[PDB]
Paper text:
The [name].1.5 variant of [name]-[name]-2 has rapidly achieved global dominance and exhibits a high growth advantage over previous variants. Preliminary reports suggest that the success of [name].1.5 stems from mutations within its spike glycoprotein, causing immune evasion and enhanced receptor binding. In late 2022, a recombination occurred between Omicron sub-lineages BA.2.75 and BA.2.10.1 resulting in a new variant [name].1 and its further sub-lineage [name].1.5, the latter of which rapidly became the most dominantly sequenced lineage in the United States. We find that while the [name].1.5 maintains a high binding affinity for human [name] as similar to previous variants, it has a diminished affinity for mouse [name], representing a departure from earlier [name]-[name]-2 variants.
Focused-refinement of the [name].1.5 [name] bound to mACE2 was possible, allowing for detailed analysis of interactions at this binding interface. Figure 3D shows that the positioning of mACE2, relative to the [name], is preserved between BA.2 and [name].1.5 RBDs, suggesting that large structural changes do not rationalize the binding affinity differences, rather a dissection of interactions at the binding interface may provide mechanistic insights. Indeed, differential side-chain interactions are observed at amino acid position 493 between the BA.2 and [name].1.5 RBDs. While Q493 may have been expected to gain an interaction with mACE2 residue Q34, this residue is found in a rotamer facing away from Q493 and therefore beyond typical interaction distance (>4 Å). mACE2–[name] interactions at the N501Y and Y505H mutated sites are near identical between BA.2 and [name].1.5, suggesting preserved affinity at this site. In sum, our functional and structural data suggest that the loss of interactions caused by the R493Q revertant mutation lessens [name].1.5 spike–mACE2 binding affinity, yet the binding affinity is not abolished due to preserved favourable contributions from the conserved N501Y and Y505H mutations. While the [name].1.5 variant contains the N501Y and Y505H mutations, it does not harbour the Q493R mutation, and as such, we hypothesized that the absence of this mutation may impact its ability to engage mACE2 and could represent a departure from the omicron lineages with regards to mACE2 binding. As expected, this assay recapitulated the previously reported enhanced mACE2 binding by BA.2 spike as compared to WT, while demonstrating substantially decreased - though not abolished - mACE2 binding by the [name].1.5 spike.
Numbering used by the authors:
A (entry chain D): 20 to 612
B (entry chain A): 330 to 530
Amino acid sequence: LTEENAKTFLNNFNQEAEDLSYQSSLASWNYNTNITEENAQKMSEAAAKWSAFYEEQSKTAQSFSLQEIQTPIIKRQLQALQQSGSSALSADKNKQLNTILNTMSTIYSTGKVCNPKNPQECLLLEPGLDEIMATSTDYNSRLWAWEGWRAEVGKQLRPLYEEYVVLKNEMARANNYNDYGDYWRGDYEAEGADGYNYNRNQLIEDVERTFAEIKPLYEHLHAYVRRKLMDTYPSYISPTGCLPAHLLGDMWGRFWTNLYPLTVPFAQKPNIDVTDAMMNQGWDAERIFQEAEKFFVSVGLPHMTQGFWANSMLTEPADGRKVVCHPTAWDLGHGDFRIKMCTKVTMDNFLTAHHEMGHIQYDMAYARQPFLLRNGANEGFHEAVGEIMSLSAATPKHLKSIGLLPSDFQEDSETEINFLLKQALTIVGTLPFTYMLEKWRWMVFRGEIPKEQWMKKWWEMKREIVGVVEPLPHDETYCDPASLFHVSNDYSFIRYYTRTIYQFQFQEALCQAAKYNGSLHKCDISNSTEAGQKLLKMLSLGNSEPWTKALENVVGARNMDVKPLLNYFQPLFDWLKEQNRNSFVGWNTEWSP
Amino acid sequence: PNITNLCPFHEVFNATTFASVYAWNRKRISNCVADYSVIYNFAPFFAFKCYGVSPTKLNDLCFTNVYADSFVIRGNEVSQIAPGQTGNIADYNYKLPDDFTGCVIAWNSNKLDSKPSGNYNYLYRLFRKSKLKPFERDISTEIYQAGNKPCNGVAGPNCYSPLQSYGFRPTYGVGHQPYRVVVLSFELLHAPATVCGPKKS
Ligand SMILES: *[C@@H]1O[C@H](CO)[C@@H](O[C@@H]2O[C@H](CO)[C@@H](O[C@@H]3O[C@H](CO)[C@@H](O)[C@H](O)[C@@H]3O)[C@H](O)[C@H]2NC(C)=O)[C@H](O)[C@H]1NC(C)=O
Ligand SMILES: *[C@@H]1O[C@H](CO)[C@@H](O[C@@H]2O[C@H](CO)[C@@H](O)[C@H](O)[C@H]2NC(C)=O)[C@H](O)[C@H]1NC(C)=O
Ligand SMILES: *[C@@H]1O[C@H](CO)[C@@H](O)[C@H](O)[C@H]1NC(C)=O
């Protein structure tokens, strides 16, 4: 029978897969933590063998027909294995698409904009232009950096995107999808028992529904940021207009976290930084990860493995080998869980350690699942379950519990307000940008946006959704979205929006589980084994079950809900309502200075 | 009388090479004195579960035959070497009866059985037509025919080679590291019991 043949095929597959995937992951670790040419070529052959084996098994797995498979775990495993991906096209189209992707990657990584009248002061984006976007206050220098990178990237990436859209559309229609947007929305598709069914076309309307009620909080935050920036820039920002695109603290306006010095509520109250306390008590990276482990065992999740302490790098090695500075949690397979993080003794690295150990705990929990189901429930779950740990670790209760913050510390309302505003600039401000960018990409891939009216549509929606106006008029020879890293390198962007919603949903569920009676932003889940079990029920599943079932296992709901997000930012929302009485909340679509 | 002719336990729990679980090694032990104290002090043991006899009384008991079965499995499967259990190892590699009288001893063997390139010399049977009977071994390498078409000996679609490799590596997690297992099975028959412990005065 076909189902028994599929069961034996998966049993035959898991043993060979786990081994080749471990070889590939170990070679990738040995390259990422000892950058050289020989470790790169070893990584290349390991990934080549693993990819060749995966495509060879995928071709045999496509012979099975899913209409006569009844057990949903085998059906989900065969669904995961039968995703050919980019291999569905012919060799010529696949090679052309790979050429376009590689040239986009190597032209984004080598992007170059240079100072007019000062030809020696030529700046790349990664070391120097991001510093200008983050720190500089000069209007003309930001206008230069923004417009120059827009010109020397959009003009060069417009035709590349023109055939990139067509090739990705061909690949998606070769994989039985309507467009490439539906191919990306297929990551949220859940096929399961009645009531847990999620469809790709549903996701758009769910995102719009969850954006229908974040909009008042975003509008009040936008009005406050606009007034403070008007204080900073006297005549270049209008009270009733949109914000200029180059005054948002980032290159693209993705995160508003760099506007915190300009938009601080209470400048006299300092932040809750505890870096100097770590310096005074002689903390090191080992103590940071040990405190993170103490947090995860206090909540009920398992301890870290001995191989985690033995094999991971938690410090810059400083013995002559080059490493990648980015923190990454690695699930190499066969019970090997590592963290690559160049941990300095700071507060940010402490929260980052909690985040990455949250990733490792998520990876450790679903190790009992079969090989093809050792992933997150969707693309948003994996980062949300680390962000919740970062949220709980940063509270003044947790910092007073572990000795970092003095025992006689008084939590006044002003530090809560400015902490919540910093959290909003990081978290709330990225949501209209994320939604507008994914909506634009979906409508471009769908063909709803005409080919010759791309730019004119985008700057309308940034005026409408994000409330951010262009500084200079752009015609259709520009490709202004393509200046972003995620879109020039073929990455889905809606995962950050879903991450943001799932994060506060998980946090409210765990705080109700822990019987916390206060404001949600002050909640700590330390010493609450029942909350850890409530979490671990979802963590143990992986993608074995539909993500709606895992979401119901944590929060008791089967869809995205932003009532926890608004409940988290409720003191800040009340404060922003209190200081927007005289001003105008909202923006006008026409270009106001 | 003087204590001599001790049973060769130093050759079972300390061999330079153990066997795959599919072709598990069996040594019969008879006509000697059973000094189980050497077994006790031979390594730190992950499990010394004894099914049917108590760990202490052993020396003062006298059995007719003692079978020492030695093999290497992965740590996660050590729970399967017990009566009444199921899995790949219990069903297709090594089965203990439900009335098993004896002990199962397992210890970690990373320093001896793990290689960084991968130890591909420890094999296990993943596919078998029927489950194994207690104390049975199958050494057959016949291609497992999982479908309806005959395999014809050559590996191919729906035809899988039954012996898979335990690719042991030193950086694996504790549940996947190689564990050496010795199963002591004590049997009494109508014959005079000739395996008893030491006597003192
Ligand atoms: C979660 O549970 C642990 C253990 O129950 C809590 O740690 C405990 O924290 C209290 C207050 O910080 C400690 O009490 C004081 O400790 C100092 C230093 O030893 C001592 O001089 C004082 O006289 C008093 O005993 C307690 O010792 C400590 N226990 C342990 C085992 O660390 C932790 O605070 C809890 N966290 C939360 C958020 O509830
Ligand atoms: C970093 O990588 C280099 C090579 O990629 C390692 O150097 C090798 O070390 C092994 C074991 O001593 C030798 O057999 C090789 O011949 C060495 N190759 C070279 C080119 O030197 C080095 O040991 C690695 N460092 C760490 C800390 O793992
Ligand atoms: C047991 O194994 C160790 C490891 O090599 C060896 O040194 C020792 O001689 C062995 N003892 C016996 C009695 O075989």
